[PDB]
Design a binder for this molecule. Structure first.
Ligand SMILES: *[C@@H]1O[C@H](CO)[C@@H](O[C@@H]2O[C@H](CO)[C@@H](O[C@@H]3O[C@H](CO)[C@@H](O)[C@H](O[C@H]4O[C@H](CO[C@H]5O[C@H](CO)[C@@H](O)[C@H](O)[C@@H]5O)[C@@H](O)[C@H](O)[C@@H]4O)[C@@H]3O)[C@H](O)[C@H]2NC(C)=O)[C@H](O)[C@H]1NC(C)=O
Ligand SMILES: *[C@@H]1O[C@H](CO)[C@@H](O[C@@H]2O[C@H](CO)[C@@H](O)[C@H](O)[C@H]2NC(C)=O)[C@H](O)[C@H]1NC(C)=O
Ligand SMILES: *[C@@H]1O[C@H](CO)[C@@H](O[C@@H]2O[C@H](CO)[C@@H](O)[C@H](O)[C@H]2NC(C)=O)[C@H](O)[C@H]1NC(C)=O
Ligand SMILES: *[C@@H]1O[C@H](CO)[C@@H](O[C@@H]2O[C@H](CO)[C@@H](O)[C@H](O)[C@H]2NC(C)=O)[C@H](O)[C@H]1NC(C)=O
Ligand SMILES: *[C@@H]1O[C@H](CO)[C@@H](O)[C@H](O)[C@H]1NC(C)=O
Ligand SMILES: [Ca+2]
Length: 1373
């Protein structure tokens, strides 16, 4: 009965048959479920179900009966089935089939409804008698994302089937059995079924908004009553309403959906019921008022992840993780509590911190570093204060003088090499003389004979005679002899004078081979260099335990850290952490490691691989119950416990050397539990494994290495070929090759080990020390704090937990892209009092999923959150807890829209049994309020209106009732495109390649789409639908400079096996890519700078525009016509697709036939990083200026913008031919001609006249863009980053479209146009219009009035459109 508004969304592809959709949804990624169901339907089991409901009903019984799903999984199936998540996955098959299969399958197809493809041969019969062809085109045997494989087989078989018919069943069975035998491996691909109709797909999982477009007024329903002017209490009173209701869940939804309507209905409470001013004790501790925050098992989610699709994928990943944990007897509640524990999160923060290594002599008994300083005892610094407050009371870029030990620099130097020696002599000494507060040390490098001797020489000379004498030899040697061989002619001269009083123990003189001096000193030195990997082709310098390789300007790097370390000391001083009796260098050495291994501590910080340990001992039980195992000792403690597994090639020296070290390490550490895996031209071998398991008891009784070597040779054994099988499966699961050495401690993998000298006994010790710290100790404390320490029964038992919690903290989203914040699971909201602001839904005891929502009722973002969370709360095995936190800071109206979310937790069915389409229905809509319809769609989606007879930008029920006779409005949108978006990087010095051009292709067409790489995050996007695509760099400069190794389809990575350029989209989340591009031979080149096409493709003239109303669209029709009458040339029109009405959209082919022009619809989705516009008018303006380079195809040389309200009397070519004098775009200035208008000319004021020193204030109603130059100058990137930067201030750009080119005319040239090109009554005189080319209707007479009065021929154009519209309406086929 009530006046209603109904909005529905339909996809750009027809609805796949329901049967196939249920198969796909049902078997998400478990193949066994897939084929086990494929058998069931090939029985003809699902033939007796006539309707979608019946068919859906049948699947529930089947899944439950065959043990496939439990309550939790069944419930998750229903929601995912509602969402229609599997439909794009099925359409991927069809697009692939339509575009690559059909054109590469030459012949005459008759009876070939289904057909196997074997060895590029097609067989239309199960009997497999004859082959129709050698299939043309690329190999189809490529295993791609939507594939499934059944069985292992030398031969590869593919069946393209239309499952719907009965014709399928015999073909399936032919290859199912063939796979069961082992002849070949089976996989199914789809064929668009002609039994089904070409009806479009109805989607859900989006939101609709009804935005009030007049917000200015404030001091069933008619209009919202505006209330004076105590906004401040809205959130607070709104929060109470709910609490009071007692069915609170439903209240919030009912209140939050129609919130603008209930504003004046909240002025009454009656007295606020503010018991909950109590819970700002909650605010005082953790979150600021009016902030929306969601947590999923501790995981802090960003806004983009809060949609139905984003949330379904998170549960799927999360349950897999938790189920892994609860096989150890932990409740979902206990499991989550452990994952988000304080001690756990602390560890992640701890090793987010930068790492230092212990540069000290202490291990080498103070006989390796030869310091040129001592700041506490040098009698140079004697003058200076040895006070801490000297450090703390410092400001500037200068170095504070002090007599204290605080900064150290150790540089390893080769005394054979002149360049190396020069560093010490010139570099190091100046610094000493200069009284710098840094201690300078250096350790010689010993790689050759001469080097060994010269270390001895210098070391000796220091020991007896002193630093000055040693320095003296070095100085003299460098200038005098200029070589790294010891020179006595030079050496003896030094002793002659410098041999005065050599103190301490006396000099022995020449020659040197001291049993102690040569042995201990040189070998101790070698032990220092080896320990910190401070040698080789490129040596490593250590400043405050921070490695800086000896390259480029390392001192510049050192100085940067020197200041950064000083500021680190000062802040500890202001908090009073520091005290007078302290060794200051040890502030840095607190967390420093003794040994530096590039495997444990890779320079790529991200490089980390962890495996699920439980999985390893579950999948390969056959293998791991027969490997030589050294159990960790009977009498050792939980803290000592750790599990190690060594994978090595025992047929190689490196492989068996590595194991000896692991065995040695085990003798020392009684807590470790060791496993040995033989990997293996010999195949397998179970023999070598059997040789060791016999010696298992006697393991680590190997006094010498040959005892291990000999044990491998002796004994006669019978190969356990069952062992061999599980062995090769393990490596395949763990993604590791044959003859490769690896080390696994508590799930963490290091390798491949090329040389066993890289991983020694000392390396295992630090590996355990570091790993222990981070992963094991935080798990142990946390675990015990909860009292779950009963569940740990040994080293292997413990590894399952530690390995799982390490996998929990690895992000889905790379840090720095969507949010800078790390993957830290907080438990910090557990402190909060809950009685009067919280309510829970779902069983906490059973729940695997725990949601914590902190929603502000006054927020528009809250409207969406509530709606989505209610549907996810309906799922079994999910728990939700809600916190309401309003703000007292309300300067403007809080919620200015009505909201509806289209989503169901389980599918709905027709009276006919068909699946119910889901719609957003607003009932009891105010009759007098002007409303705007908006779509709040998931990030990967591109949406436009398809069916509507109303103005969605200007909705009023009273007008529709008075014009149409109906109080009911119905509109349909189309999900036209789904995004392929990615973040590029250059290799190896990873930077965003800007100006790079890309081409998206398909086998049908080699030019689907094209875009250019942006500066910010190497961002790019493509508009596509489900299917198989490829990304080729655009032929030209781009392919000349670069080669793209990969499209990052597997993740940020590189994940092995991703050296691919193929993209496929089979999800409603689109495709997220992280491509990599490496520069071709010796290039520092740039695309942007040099070393009739567009006309032919498009038109002589290319004009683009935008309109946001029926009036503005009516005026746009006139604009196009005026051009046409005024030019005997070819014109193409370009439009911003999503701002136009379907009435306009359905009309243009008719305008195109009449006026003889071509048209193309264009759009681009506003990037996630780029700053949004809440106000639609502002969005529109942004579209005209921010995306000029990326909105139009590369093939377009140039474009012209003409405003909707405009009219043109000129042949528009002239604007093309207008010389731009190397400028990217051309504009027309503001009229000075009107005499008395001055007052309102704001661009002659302080701000605009100071800024525009001499430059004009231009008009955005008309302009030329020399697109080739625009992109070449990379103007867009600059516009975008200046806009983003300026936009932080809300009052920054009054009219951005005009203001951005004007603000950028210093930076980006603007060609100025003759003013013959623009006329506006408001600012130009009437005398001017005789020579006027075009007219804008700039802004109290209305726009319709100005047109008729200002231009006499406006009516002539309007009549032409009017009769044609009627001619079309009266044209019925
Ligand atoms: C893809 O999905 C399918 C379907 O959910 C998963 O495949 C199922 O895997 C089961 C084993 O993991 C298998 O059941 C086995 O049946 C034999 C014969 O009775 C048992 O010897 C096995 O024992 C192992 O698993 C049990 C599990 O507890 C069960 O105990 C009794 C057994 O009678 C059941 O009544 C009870 O409900 C429990 O489920 C352990 O207790 C044992 O120690 C032992 O390790 C298995 O029970 C299923 O037949 C198999 N297929 C189907 C259709 O269910 C598959 O794992 C999954 N794949 C992935 C990648 O997730
Ligand atoms: C809120 O509600 C009503 C106002 O609507 C208050 O009650 C009124 O009390 C006066 C006497 O002080 C009576 O003359 C009115 O007739 C009452 N109104 C009604 C509708 O009964 C009430 O005191 C307010 N505050 C609280 C705590 O409820
Ligand atoms: C949660 O609420 C309790 C009250 O139920 C708070 O307890 C207070 O504790 C202090 C001592 O630490 C007492 O002197 C107060 O009287 C208590 N408050 C009340 C209202 O009685 C507790 O501090 C609150 N915690 C948080 C995090 O808000
Ligand atoms: C555009 O259209 C036509 C050419 O097809 C030109 O029209 C002719 O103009 C002369 C002089 O004004 C008339 O006497 C003829 O009768 C016209 N012929 C036709 C077929 O229209 C017109 O001048 C051209 N204008 C421009 C600007 O190119
Ligand atoms: C204070 O000085 C002592 C030595 O006297 C030192 O061990 C301690 O670490 C210093 N205090 C702090 C808080 O670090
Ligand atoms: Ca205008």
């Amino acid at each position: 009965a009530s006046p209603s508004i109904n909005v529905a969304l339909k996809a750009a592809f027809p609805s796949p048959p329901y049967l196939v959709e249920l198969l796909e949804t049902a078997a998400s990624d478990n193949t066994t479920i897939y084929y086990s169901l494929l058998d069931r339907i090939a029985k003809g089991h699902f033939a007796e179900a006539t309707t979608d409901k019946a068919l859906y009903e049948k699947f529930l019984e089947v899944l439950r009966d065959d043990g496939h799903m439990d309550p939790e999984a069944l419930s998750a199936f229903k929601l995912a089935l509602s969402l229609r998540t599997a439909t794009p996955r099925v359409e991927a098959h069809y697009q692939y089939y339509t575009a690559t299969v059909e054109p590469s399958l030459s012949g005459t197809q008759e009876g070939c409804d289904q057909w196997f493809l074997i060895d590029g041969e097609q067989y239309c019969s199960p009997t497999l008698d004859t082959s129709h062809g050698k299939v043309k085109g690329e190999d189809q045997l490529r295993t791609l994302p939507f594939d499934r494989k059944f069985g292992v087989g030398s031969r590869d078989v593919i069946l393209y089937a239309d499952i719907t018919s009965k014709s399928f069943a015999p073909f399936h069975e032919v290859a199912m059995d063939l796979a069961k035998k082992g002849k070949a491996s089976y996989r199914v691909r789809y064929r668009r079924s002609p039994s089904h109709s070409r009806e479009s797909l109805s989607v859900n999982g989006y939101g609709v908004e009804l935005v009030l477009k007049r917000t200015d007024y404030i001091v069933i329903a008619d209009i919202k009553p505006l209330e004076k002017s105590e906004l401040a209490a809205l959130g607070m009173k709104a929060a109470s309403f709910v609490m009071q209701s007692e069915k609170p869940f439903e209240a919030l939804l009912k209140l939050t959906q129609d919130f603008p309507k209930y504003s004046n209905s909240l002025g009454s409470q009656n007295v606020s019921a503010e018991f909950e001013a109590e819970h700002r004790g909650n605010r005082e501790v953790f979150l600021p008022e009016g902030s929306n925050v969601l947590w999923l098992n501790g995981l802090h989610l960003i806004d983009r992840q809060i949609q139905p699709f984003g949330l379904v994928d998170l549960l799927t990943r999360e349950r897999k993780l938790i189920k892994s944990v609860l096989d150890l007897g932990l409740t979902g509640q206990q499991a989550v509590d452990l994952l988000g524990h304080a001690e756990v999160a602390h560890a992640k923060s701890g090793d987010d911190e930068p790492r230092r290594f212990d540069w000290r002599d202490d291990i080498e008994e103070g006989q390796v570093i030869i310091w040129l300083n001592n700041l506490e005892k040098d009698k140079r610094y004697k003058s200076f204060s040895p006070s801490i407050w000297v450090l703390i009371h410092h400001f500037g870029h200068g170095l504070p003088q002090i007599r204290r030990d605080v900064f150290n620099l150790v540089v390893p130097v080769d005394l054979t090499k002149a360049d190396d020696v020069k560093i010490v002599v010139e570099g190091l000494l100046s610094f000493v003389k200069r009284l710098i507060p840094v201690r300078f040390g250096f350790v010689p490098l010993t790689p050759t004979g001469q080097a060994i001797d010269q270390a001895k020489v210098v070391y000796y000379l220091l020991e007896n005679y002193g630093l000055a004498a040693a320095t003296a030899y070095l100085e003299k040697s460098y200038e005098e002899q200029s070589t790294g061989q010891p020179n006595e002619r030079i050496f003896n001269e030094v002793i002659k004078d410098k041999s005065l009083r050599p103190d301490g123990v006396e000099l022995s003189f020449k020659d040197i081979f001291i049993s102690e001096k040569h042995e201990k000193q040189i070998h101790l030195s070698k032990h220092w260099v080896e320990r910190l990997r401070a040698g080789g082709d490129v040596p490593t310098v250590f400043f405050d335990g921070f490695p800086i390789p000896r390259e480029d300007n390392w001192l510049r790097v050192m100085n940067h850290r020197l200041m950064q370390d000083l500021q680190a000391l000062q802040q500890a001083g202001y908090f009073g952490m520091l005290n007078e009796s302290m060794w200051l260098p040890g502030f840095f050495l607190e967390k420093a490691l003794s040994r530096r291994n590039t495997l444990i501590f890779p320079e790529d910080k991200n490089e980390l691989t962890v495996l699920n340990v439980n999985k390893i001992y579950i999948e390969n039980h056959d293998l791991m119950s027969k490997v030589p195992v050294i159990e960790a000792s009977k009498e050792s403690t939980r803290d000592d416990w750790a599990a190690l597994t060594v994978v090595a090639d025992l047929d190689d020296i490196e492989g068996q050397e590595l194991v000896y070290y692991a065995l040695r390490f085990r003798k020392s550490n009684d807590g470790v539990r060791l496993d040995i895996v033989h990997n293996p031209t010999s195949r397998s071998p179970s023999v070598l494994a059997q040789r060791l398991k016999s010696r298992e008891d006697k393991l680590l009784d190997f006094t010498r290495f040959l005892d291990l070597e000999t044990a491998l040779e002796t004994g006669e054994f019978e190969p356990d070929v069952a062992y061999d099988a599980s062995l090769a499966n393990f490596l395949a699961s763990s993604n590791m090759k044959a003859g490769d050495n690896f080390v696994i401690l508590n799930g963490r993998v290091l390798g491949p080990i090329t040389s066993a000298d890289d991983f020694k006994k000392e390396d295992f010790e630090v590996f355990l020390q570091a790993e222990r710290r981070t992963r094991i100790l935080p798990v142990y404390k946390a675990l015990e704090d909860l009292g779950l320490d009963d569940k740990v029964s040994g080293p292997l038992s413990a590894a399952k937990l530690t390995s799982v919690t390490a996998l929990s903290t690895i992000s889905d989203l790379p840090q720095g892209i969507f949010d800078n914040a790390p993957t830290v699971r907080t438990t910090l909201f557990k402190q909060w009092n809950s009685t009067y602001t919280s309510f829970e839904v779902g069983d906490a005891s059973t729940a695997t999923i725990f949601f914590v929502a902190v929603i502000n009722p006054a927020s528009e973002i809250g409207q969406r959150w509530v709606a989505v969370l209610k549907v996810l709360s309906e799922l079994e095995g999910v728990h939700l807890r809600v916190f309401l936190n309003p703000t007292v800071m309300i300067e403007e109206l809080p919620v200015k829209r009505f909201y509806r979310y289209v989503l169901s937790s389980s599918p709905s069915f027709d009276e006919s049994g068909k699946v119910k389409a889901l719609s957003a229905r607003f009932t009891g809509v105010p009759r007098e309020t002007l409303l705007v319809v908006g779509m709040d769609v998931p990030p990967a989606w591109l949406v436009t209106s398809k069916v509507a007879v109303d103005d969605l930008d200007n909705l009023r029920i009273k007008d529709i009732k008075a014009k149409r006779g109906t109080e009911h409005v119905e509109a349909i949108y189309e999900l036209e495109h789904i995004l392929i978006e990615g973040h590029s990087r250059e290799i190896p010095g990873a930077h965003a390649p800007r100006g790079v051009q890309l081409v998206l292709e398909t086998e049908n067409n080699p030019h689907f789409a094209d875009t250019i790489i942006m500066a910010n995050l190497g961002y790019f996007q493509f508009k596509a639908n489900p299917g198989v695509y490829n990304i080729r760099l655009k032929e030209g400069r781009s392919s000349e400079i670069f080669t793209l190794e990969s499209v990052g389809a597997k993740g940020w990575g590189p994940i092995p096996g991703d050296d691919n350029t193929e993209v496929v989209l089979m999800d409603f989340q689109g495709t997220t890519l992280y491509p990599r591009l490496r520069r071709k031979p010796g290039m520092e080149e740039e695309d942007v700078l040099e070393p009739s096409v567009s006309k032919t493709e498009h038109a002589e003239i290319n004009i683009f525009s935008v309109a946001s109303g029926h009036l503005y669209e009516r005026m746009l029709n006139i604009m196009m016509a005026s051009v046409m009458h005024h030019t005997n040339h070819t014109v193409k029109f370009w439009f911003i697709e999503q701002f136009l009405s379907p009435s306009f959209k359905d009309f243009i082919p008719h305008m195109a036939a009449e006026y003889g022009f071509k048209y193309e619809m264009v759009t681009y989705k506003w990037p996630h990083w780029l700053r949004q516009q809440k106000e639609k008018q502002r969005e529109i303006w942004g579209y005209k200026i921010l995306f000029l380079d990326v909105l139009f195809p590369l093939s377009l040389d140039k474009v012209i913008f003409v405003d909707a309200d405009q009219i043109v009397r000129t042949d528009m070519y002239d604007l093309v031919e207008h010389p731009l004098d190397g400028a990217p775009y051309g504009f027309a200035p503001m009229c000075d001609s009107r005499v008395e208008m001055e007052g309102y000319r704001f661009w002659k004021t302080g701000y605009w006249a100071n800024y525009l020193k001499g430059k004009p204030y231009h008009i955005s109603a008309l302009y030329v863009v020399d697109l080739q130059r625009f992109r070449e100058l990379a103007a867009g990137d600059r516009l975008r980053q200046q806009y983003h930067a300026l936009s932080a201030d809300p009052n920054s750009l009054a009219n951005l479209d005009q203001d951005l080119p004007n603000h950028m005319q210093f930076t980006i040239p603007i060609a100025t146009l003759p003013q013959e090109w623009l006329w506006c009554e408001t600012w130009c005189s009437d005398e001017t219009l005789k020579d006027a080319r075009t007219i804008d209707l700039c802004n109290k007479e209305p726009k319709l009035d100005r047109a008729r009065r200002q231009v006499p021929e406006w009516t002539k154009y309007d009549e032409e459109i009017a009769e044609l519209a009627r001619r079309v309406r009266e044209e019925k086929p």
